[PDB]
Symmetry: C3
């Protein structure tokens, strides 16, 4: 019965609606902008570094709340997409792949054809197969660009926050259907 579903959604809504300053502190520390799209799983934060690089970090809040984290760094001009695995318990990152794309658009465009273009191109060897010194220098480069414990903490806590907001909107949409 639609009434029975509606009653439970109504009571769950009231409860669910019932640390922002930690988000603001971390984002402002690195001069991040948060790109927030309510209704979608992916969250994005973007900043510009002292050396003129643009750093994008993408994560899937539903996957989190090992997770896939995409760090894209550009200097139109070439960008490297680092696909990372983040340990949710440890707050640690591991490089899975690093792919040099000819532009930020090539790295990030969500169109069907842009995805196919990414699928077809070489993504570098398994990271574990690289020279150890190459592995290390790339990890230290990412670290120096803010891929660290503070970022992992933000990703975890912001994912918990956004997903709960997504859950609330979902409850609301369900309520409208079952009304």
């Amino acid at each position: 019965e639609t009434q029975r579903v509606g009653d439970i959604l109504q009571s769950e809504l009231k409860i669910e609606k019932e640390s922002l300053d930690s988000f603001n502190d971390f984002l402002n520390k690195y001069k991040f902008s948060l790109v927030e799209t309510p209704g979608k799983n992916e969250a994005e934060i973007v900043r510009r570094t002292e050396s003129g690089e643009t750093v994008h970090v993408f994560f899937d809040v539903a996957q989190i709340a090992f997770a896939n984290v995409n760090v894209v760094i550009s200097k139109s001009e070439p960008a490297v997409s680092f696909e990372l695995l983040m340990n949710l318990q440890e707050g640690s990152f591991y490089v899975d792949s690093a792919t040099p794309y000819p532009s930020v658009d090539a790295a990030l465009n969500q169109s069907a054809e842009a995805e196919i273009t990414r699928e077809l191109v070489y993504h570098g060897p398994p990271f574990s197969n690289l020279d150890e010194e190459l592995q290390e220098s790339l990890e230290a480069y990412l670290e120096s660009r803010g891929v660290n414990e503070e970022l992992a903490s933000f990703i975890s806590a912001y994912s918990e926050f956004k997903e709960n907001n997504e859950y609330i909107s979902w409850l609301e949409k369900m309520k409208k259907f079952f009304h």
Copy 2:
């Protein structure tokens, strides 16, 4: 040798060509229309309920003959897509996800961009993470809309029927190639 393949296809064809009333009885009982597309894996049945809802049920005959069953219910206006897992031996269903879409088209359009749109949006939490009473009321709602043992029986038997027809057409197409 092409002749050797052709001989075996020819003999398999003759054998394979060598309960419809149960299909008709179940479909008519619920006032279903069957949407049958020969050559394709997916089968669709659709009906309108006493309360003016439209219920679509989709299943993949090749997967069946746990299976994925998509039940889409609409009232242009919002639709909820219930993604179910069906126990093939038991004839039982389990809710994996329920996603409210803003229209039937958004839920069902097979275009590349429509699929991408579905992939990007929030699909609700894991069903197991919902309040137990919410889980139950949604399951009972689906039951009341004909997601039951009779539907599971139809899905199993119709999948066996259609797949065998697909196998026959496949044999025929192979025969033409090897001629």
Copy 3:
């Protein structure tokens, strides 16, 4: 530090740059043309047989260096796509599926919609479910068309060659980014 990454890439480049006749011997023996697209994972070889068939063989060099090998055989006019699994150690092939498409374009076009079209159509039953004599005659047909130990050897060695070239180009692109 970008300098530290650049140094290691520079030294790896110098080392990596530091049997072609076996490629030429096998390709020429079967009158293959190699279709080589630097920067992409997939390699393609294509020939025309004595009976006027066109045989395409596709493989993913990154997957190789069990691998997926697609053998497409045409006579505009219908083509059968054989999806094979190749044992990398044994140099042996196993048929996973054989799908008759109405044209080479339908079988091979890489567009988003062409992929969706392939995903939706019936792919024949599990190969293991076929009559044993049908399984055998299809395997012997592929053999007679050059799906053999020589082809497996080429696929393995050419995959090693191309992937290393892809690795070199990747190092070069990384060098440019970190400069």
